[PDB]
Amino acid sequence: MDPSQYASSSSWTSFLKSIASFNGDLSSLSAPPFILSPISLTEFSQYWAEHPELFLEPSFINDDNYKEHCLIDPEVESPELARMLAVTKWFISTLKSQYCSRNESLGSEKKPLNPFLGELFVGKWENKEHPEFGETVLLSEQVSHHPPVTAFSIFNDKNKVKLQGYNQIKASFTKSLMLTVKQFGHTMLDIKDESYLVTPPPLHIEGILVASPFVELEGKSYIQSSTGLLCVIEFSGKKNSFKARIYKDSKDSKDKEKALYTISGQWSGSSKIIKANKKEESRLFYDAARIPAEHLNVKPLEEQHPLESRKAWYDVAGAIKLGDFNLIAKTKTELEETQRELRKEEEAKGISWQRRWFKDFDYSVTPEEGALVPEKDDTFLKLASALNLSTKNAPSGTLVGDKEDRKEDLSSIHWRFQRELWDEEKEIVL
Amino acid sequence: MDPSQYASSSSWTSFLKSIASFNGDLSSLSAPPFILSPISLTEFSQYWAEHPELFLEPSFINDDNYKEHCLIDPEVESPELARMLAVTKWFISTLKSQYCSRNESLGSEKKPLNPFLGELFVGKWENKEHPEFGETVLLSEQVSHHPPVTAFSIFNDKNKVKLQGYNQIKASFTKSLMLTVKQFGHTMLDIKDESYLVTPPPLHIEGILVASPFVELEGKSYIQSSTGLLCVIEFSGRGYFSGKKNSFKARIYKDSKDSKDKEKALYTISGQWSGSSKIIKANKKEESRLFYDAARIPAEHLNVKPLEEQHPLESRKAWYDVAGAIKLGDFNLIAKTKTELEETQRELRKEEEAKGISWQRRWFKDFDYSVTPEEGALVPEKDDTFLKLASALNLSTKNAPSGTLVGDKEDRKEDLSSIHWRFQRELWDEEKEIVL
Ligand SMILES: CCC(=O)OC[C@H](C)CC[C@H]1O[C@H]2C[C@H]3[C@@H]4CC=C5C[C@@H](O)CC[C@]5(C)[C@H]4CC[C@]3(C)[C@H]2[C@@H]1C
Ligand SMILES: CCC(=O)OC[C@H](C)CC[C@H]1O[C@H]2C[C@H]3[C@@H]4CC=C5C[C@@H](O)CC[C@]5(C)[C@H]4CC[C@]3(C)[C@H]2[C@@H]1C
Numbered sequence: 001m002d003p004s005q006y007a008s009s010s011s012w013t014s015f016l017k018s019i020a021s022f023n024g025d026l027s028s029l030s031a032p033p034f035i036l037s038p039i040s041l042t043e044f045s046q047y048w049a050e051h052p053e054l055f056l057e058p059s060f061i062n063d064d065n066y067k068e069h070c071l072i073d074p075e076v077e078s079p080e081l082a083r084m085l086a087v088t089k090w091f092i093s094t095l096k097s098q099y100c101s102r103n104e105s106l107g108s109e110k111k112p113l114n115p116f117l118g119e120l121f122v123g124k125w126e127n128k129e130h131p132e133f134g135e136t137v138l139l140s141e142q143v144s145h146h147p148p149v150t151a152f153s154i155f156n157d158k159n160k161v162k163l164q165g166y167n168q169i170k171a172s173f174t175k176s177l178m179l180t181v182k183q184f185g186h187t188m189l190d191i192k193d194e195s196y197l198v199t200p201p202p203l204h205i206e207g208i209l210v211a212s213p214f215v216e217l218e219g220k221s222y223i224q225s226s227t228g229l230l231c232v233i234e235f236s237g238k239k240n241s242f243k244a245r246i247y248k249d250s251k252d253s254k255d256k257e258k259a260l261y262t263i264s265g266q267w268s269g270s271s272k273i274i275k276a277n278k279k280e281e282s283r284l285f286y287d288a289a290r291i292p293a294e295h296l297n298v299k300p301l302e303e304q305h306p307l308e309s310r311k312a313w314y315d316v317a318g319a320i321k322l323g324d325f326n327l328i329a330k331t332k333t334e335l336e337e338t339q340r341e342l343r344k345e346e347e348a349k350g351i352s353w354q355r356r357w358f359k360d361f362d363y364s365v366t367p368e369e370g371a372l373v374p375e376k377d378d379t380f381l382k383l384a385s386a387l388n389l390s391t392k393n394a395p396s397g398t399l400v401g402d403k404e405d406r407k408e409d410l411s412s413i414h415w416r417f418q419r420e421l422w423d424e425e426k427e428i429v430l
Numbered sequence: 431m432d433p434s435q436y437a438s439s440s441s442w443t444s445f446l447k448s449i450a451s452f453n454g455d456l457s458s459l460s461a462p463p464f465i466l467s468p469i470s471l472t473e474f475s476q477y478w479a480e481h482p483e484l485f486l487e488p489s490f491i492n493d494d495n496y497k498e499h500c501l502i503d504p505e506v507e508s509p510e511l512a513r514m515l516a517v518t519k520w521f522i523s524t525l526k527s528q529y530c531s532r533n534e535s536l537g538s539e540k541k542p543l544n545p546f547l548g549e550l551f552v553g554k555w556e557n558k559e560h561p562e563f564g565e566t567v568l569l570s571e572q573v574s575h576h577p578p579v580t581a582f583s584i585f586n587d588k589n590k591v592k593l594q595g596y597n598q599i600k601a602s603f604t605k606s607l608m609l610t611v612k613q614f615g616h617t618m619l620d621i622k623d624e625s626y627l628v629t630p631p632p633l634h635i636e637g638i639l640v641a642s643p644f645v646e647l648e649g650k651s652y653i654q655s656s657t658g659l660l661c662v663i664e665f666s667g668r669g670y671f672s673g674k675k676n677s678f679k680a681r682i683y684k685d686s687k688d689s690k691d692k693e694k695a696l697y698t699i700s701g702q703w704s705g706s707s708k709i710i711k712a713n714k715k716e717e718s719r720l721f722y723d724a725a726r727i728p729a730e731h732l733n734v735k736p737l738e739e740q741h742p743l744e745s746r747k748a749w750y751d752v753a754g755a756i757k758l759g760d761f762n763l764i765a766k767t768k769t770e771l772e773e774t775q776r777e778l779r780k781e782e783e784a785k786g787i788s789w790q791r792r793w794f795k796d797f798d799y800s801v802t803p804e805e806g807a808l809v810p811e812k813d814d815t816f817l818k819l820a821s822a823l824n825l826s827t828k829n830a831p832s833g834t835l836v837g838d839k840e841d842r843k844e845d846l847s848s849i850h851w852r853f854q855r856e857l858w859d860e861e862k863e864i865v866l
Contacts, residue, residue, distance in 0.1 A: 002501060071435065107725065107726040322559060
């Protein structure tokens with residue numbers, strides 16, 4: 001059918017009734033095939049680096065050139081500040097990929113494939129037109145299914161830029177049938193020996209009544225650096241508007257008048273930056289329209305391992321593409337069988353397929369005997385302390401003392417990339 | 431460099447100066463590598479059919495089903511009117527492909543590759559997901575280089591949908607460096623035995639001074655059917671500053687005489703052709719329905735054969751080295767690979783001729799529509815479609831800018847010719863070399 005017919009269709013009306021008093025597992029609620037995406041959530045990790053030049057730019061800024069690497073302020077006060085500005089630009093550049101990509105490719109936000117445990121998604125940005133960049137690798141892994149958790153790393157060995165992070169959500173419907181989404185997890189970016197902790201924002205899905213879903217961001221994201229500098233990004237919705245403020249240190253963040261820079265605009269369009277309070281002098285900071293996302297290289301389907309997302313989901317995606325409710329169910333049953341047998345083969349080969357490239361670490365003050373614990377000078381702990389960030393499994397961005405942090409009965413388990421596990425990988429390639 | 435550095439760069443400042451000193455045409459001003467596109471103008475013909483379902487929809491509308499194939503008006507008065515609304519939707523859907531594709535893929539409008547004479551670009555939309563569609567074929571050919579003229583046909587044998595057209599431009603800069611572009615040519619769409627004449631609009635390239643070029647449509651396009659029905663599409667850049675762009679108003683009339691009076695519009699369509707538009711029937715203006723939302727159906731790109739299987743006349747293969755040099759931004763390699771292309775094509779033409787292969791007028795021929803045709807010219811056939819539909823529209827049959835009406839100032843230019851390029855299907859059926 002034409003999308004102009006979706007909202008008043010029998011299928012949509014039925015769907016709306018099924019969410020009107022929804023209970024249970026949103027991933028397992030039947031939906032009309034028109035609102036199904038063929039893309040799994042393990043693929044979403046790619047959205048952290050679809051502007052390779054922005055991802056790598058902070059690594060090119062040093063004590064001898066920093067004033068030449070701050071386009072909005074050639075009189076920037078320090079290379080640390082120059083690198084904070086570049087990291088903030090990179091972070092803002094990720095949002096359109098994160099939150100708009102399905103609108104562009106599918107026509108609206110849709111219901112993603114719910115990844116199987118052990119599912120992998122890998123590829124590389126070869127950066128062939130910029131040999132100083134070198135190749136950047138993505139590894140994404142579904143480390144939990146109950147509930148869905150995706151862990152990921154994106155790393156450029158040539159420039160010593162590495163990212164790792166994980167993501168999970170908790171979602172429910174409002175009375176108005178907006179889907180309220182809380183993100184959980186965090187991402188760390190290391191630029192040589194300097195680190196950044198990034199927290200994703202809460203969001204909600206609008207447009208469900210009219211069968212044209214889309215994301216609207218809310219709340220705040222943080223970017224806390226090992227240099228002390230802190231970026232606070234506040235999302236409002238005029239559509240997709242934010243404001244981001246950079247502070248000398250985290251304590252200054254209670255007072256906006258102490259912001260070194262203030263960025264405002266739309267994360268899906270243009271934003272401007274003002275230094276100090278010089279409101280009459282703003283410059284263009286980032287314009288998402290001007291810089292096309294660059295998609296990573298993923299190997300041909302013929303060459304993929306059966307754990308790899310697109311190969312694994314291929315028949316299901318075909319059954320979605322042509323709309324057959326029963327073929328969708330049949331192919332899903334077949335994936336469950338395929339994976340059951342594949343797991344047995346992995347275990348026979350001594351492969352920790354559930355914890356393939358990531359392990360889960362227990363940051364509780366007092367961890368359980370047996371648990372993996374953080375190393376002495378753990379980066380997350382140092383940055384979370386600087387930000388006054390909860391180190392518990394609270395929603396992303398929760399501060400110490402907040403309602404979700406005060407809970408006794410809340411774990412502090414976080415997924416961490418283990419590079420040696422990838423270096424020893426014997427099945428998956430790029 | 432970052433795009434924010436383009437406008438103040440030495441390169442751009444030099445480039446803007448070359449514009450006043452500009453004399454020649456576009457493919458003279460050498461322009462900096464950052465404002466070059468690696469895509470030839472022969473590929474632009476594909477923009478007429480990147481929504482295959484909308485291209486073919488009118489063929490599915492008949493006397494027994496028309497009220498079920500008119501989403502915005504299940505009480506539509508006739509199947510002819512149903513088909514006119516469908517063709518209008520199709521035409522509107524083309525515009526985002528035609529005018530926004532490079533903004534999307536390159537970050538701005540950029541200078542396309544100027545096609546060589548004889549250059550070809552072919553492909554097909556296989557429509558694998560919908561077997562009742564059948565394959566739709568694109569043939570695009572550069573029929574002139576002095577000046578650049580691209581001719582094209584897009585055809586679906588299964589459903590008897592065929593399109594043919596040609597395009598060329600005249601461009602001029604204003605003192606402020608707006609590029610005024612007049613389109614010339616027209617496009618015919620045949621839906622079984624029913625025909626439609628489509629005229630493209632004039633435009634400006636804005637944003638040159640700040641090195642972020644973009645197209646802004648202006649003026650009017652027409653869609654004149656053999657059924658008498660007429661759509662007039664008026665384009666507007668109103669609301670720039672507020673972030674509005676790409677707006678239009680389209681009105682469908684019983685015939686061209688009625689079109690002299692906006693109150694006689696059967697329907698009125700208004701909105702953004704790169705976004706959403708609504709339709710009102712009659713003047714029931716207190717109620718509208720969604721007509722088209724370009725955001726909801728992504729363009730579908732045609733299938734092109736792998737580079738290593740292309741003939742050396744085919745655009746992507748032909749321009750491959752130049753395209754790679756542009757992606758690298760390498761000025762000297764761009765000029766060197768261009769010089770190589772001219773050598774390659776010069777030799778290729780000699781080979782084509784040695785084998786008796788017409789390469790200059792391969793699938794299209796030029797027909798003289800003047801009352802007194804040049805001796806030896808090809809002339810139109812008895813009940814020519816263009817002549818009939820131009821007569822219904824009161825459109826000039828001369829080489830005036832697209833959409834010029836009989837008696838307009840441009841219709842009166844002295845000495846003006848009336849030569850129009852036409853597809854010759856038999857020439858493709860008998861093609862000696864190229865395949866899909
Ligand atoms: C049965 C489906 C249903 O309940 O309603 C379907 C609604 C029509 C759609 C709800 C889904 O919308 C998807 C949007 C997804 C988020 C988009 C981007 C990100 C960023 C990435 O870095 C982490 C994942 C995250 C937060 C996605 C999570 C899954 C979301 C909310 C999908 C909704 C289930
Ligand atoms: C030398 C470069 C120069 O002079 O100015 C550079 C400006 C920054 C860019 C000028 C170019 O902009 C391009 C836009 C092109 C039109 C876009 C779409 C269509 C639709 C299609 O169906 C027929 C062709 C047409 C009219 C294109 C014609 C060529 C245009 C105007 C390009 C300009 C050279």
